[PDB]
């Protein structure tokens, strides 16, 4: 499924991402845009046997288990396929585990390089929520 920005924002807000660890809601919407272009089924294979899954591109070597990545850690204790759903609940739950402090969004390269320092609030302004 491909989300519209306001639709994704409303969903992320319902799951408690607004101001989670001090990160305003725009940060999460901005990260999703640059990581998966709002596509829940987005997948990307990395140089290593790793693969990033879903709306927030969660890595299969450290966070989810796909049963193909060498030395899987699976710190979120959940199947990668579960992250490729129209329901973002699983993805958000995992992201919440990834961001343990106020600097945790650095877990997403796209966010650090293309969102941090910009007017991320622009992504949600005018949305109903």
């Amino acid at each position: 499924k491909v989300f519209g920005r306001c639709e994704l924002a409303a969903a992320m807000k319902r799951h408690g991402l607004d101001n989670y660890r001090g990160y305003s809601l725009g940060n999460w919407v901005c990260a999703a845009k640059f990581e998966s272009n709002f596509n829940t089924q987005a997948t990307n294979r990395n140089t290593d046997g790793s693969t990033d899954y879903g709306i927030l591109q969660i890595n299969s070597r450290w966070w989810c288990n796909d049963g193909r990545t060498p030395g899987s850690r699976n710190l979120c204790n959940i199947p990668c396929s579960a992250l490729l759903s129209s329901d973002i609940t699983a993805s958000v739950n995992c992201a919440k585990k990834i961001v343990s402090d106020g600097n945790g969004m650095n877990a997403w390269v796209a966010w650090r390089n293309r969102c941090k320092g910009t007017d991320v609030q622009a992504w949600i302004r005018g949305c109903r929520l």
Partner: antibody
Amino acid sequence: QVQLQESGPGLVAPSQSLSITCTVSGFSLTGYGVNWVRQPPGKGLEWLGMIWGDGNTDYNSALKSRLSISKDNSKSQVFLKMNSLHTDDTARYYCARERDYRLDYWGQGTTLTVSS
Amino acid sequence: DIVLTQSPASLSASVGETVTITCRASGNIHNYLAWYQQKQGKSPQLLVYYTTTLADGVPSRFSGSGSGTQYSLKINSLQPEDFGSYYCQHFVSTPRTFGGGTKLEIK
């Protein structure tokens, strides 16, 4: 340690163009915005404008035509430039770091007086 | 521009008291409001952001609340170091504006 320090001329006439420098350390100007704020003697805080991590600038509506903010990431410096100086421009000027919609660190400020 | 009406202009209180400072916006600022404290001859310091979140190092006797257009900063059991000026500022788009300020002085 995050730090910001302002540097200015202290005194200027209506004929001169004001230029204030904000030197930062402890963080990268590409990851945070920097706001400029002033405070007239015995008055409150007034927002002047800002420059985002991406170089974009936004200004106070009633001062946009006289304001100009720029920066040099390599030198870790942000500049505030003003012209058409009025006596009402007398005040202490501060630069402050913006992090996700809050100004978390402020400079000590620099006092500016505008005469004839 | 969105204007912030802050009140009261001044407050006289003694140590131990509980005071409330309010800031009303001329438009919905969607919780993007912060509070600052300024001591005589010092730079403002961030106290609260996004309406209710305390900044690092700020004591829990400070609490923020609000939604829509009415916001408040409550200080429970005022302490000697709490006296000074307080300002609110909104962060919805630009330009940003500040409240007129509130002076908290001792009795």
